[PDB]
């Protein structure tokens, strides 16, 4: 059985979040949690919250027994960007992008 | 086309293509190159042919 949890419009660039996603691709949830607990990165908190939400969904809605779950799939997409202005020298102006991302996690007992 | 006939920017110095009007027919919201007018389409036939 597949259970999915998502976090859309997360305030972070996709490239920075992708460094943490591959740390746990294919592991068991029990070791994925404490792997995520001891990395000093901002995106680790977001990915950990998504993973815990997925585990709770997989426990409540469908069957129980989270002792044999695995991270079957995980990937990060790109959300819409917000555009701003930053002044520069001699009267010029520059465009700033604030990128977002979508985070998806799939777990399965099988 | 509604608008003013002022040159958008100077001829030389800026790294942009030369422009001379905002109503040019190749700008967005510009005019039509060969715009149409109300027209008459009737032809002539001889009486004997009719």
């Amino acid at each position: 059985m597949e259970t999915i949890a998502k976090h859309r419009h997360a305030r972070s660039s996709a490239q920075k979040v992708r460094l943490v996603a591959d740390l746990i691709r294919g592991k068991k949830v029990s070791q994925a949690l404490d792997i995520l607990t001891y990395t000093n990165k901002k995106a680790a908190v977001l990915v950990k919250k998504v993973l815990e939400s997925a585990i709770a969904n997989a426990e409540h809605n469908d069957g129980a027994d989270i002792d044999d779950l695995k991270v079957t799939k995980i990937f990060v997409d790109e959300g819409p960007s917000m555009k701003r202005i930053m002044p520069r020298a001699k009267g010029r102006a520059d465009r700033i992008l604030k990128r977002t991302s979508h985070i998806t996690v799939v777990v399965s007992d099988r | 086309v509604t608008g003013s006939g002022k040159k958008p920017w100077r001829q030389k110095g800026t790294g942009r293509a030369r422009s001379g009007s905002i109503k040019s027919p190749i700008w967005r919201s510009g005019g039509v190159t060969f715009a149409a007018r109300p027209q008459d389409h009737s032809q002539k036939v001889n009486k004997k042919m009719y």
Binding site: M82, K83, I85, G91, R92, A93 | G13, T14
Partner: peptide, 26 residues
């Protein structure tokens, strides 16, 4: 809650000059 809005501005195209000597002057 409020929705996000964008704005923009263009420069006057200041007439900069090449203050060093000419490339192949007289």
């Amino acid at each position: 809650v409020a929705v996000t809005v964008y704005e923009a501005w263009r420069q006057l195209g200041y007439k900069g000059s090449w203050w060093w000597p000419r490339i192949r002057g007289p």
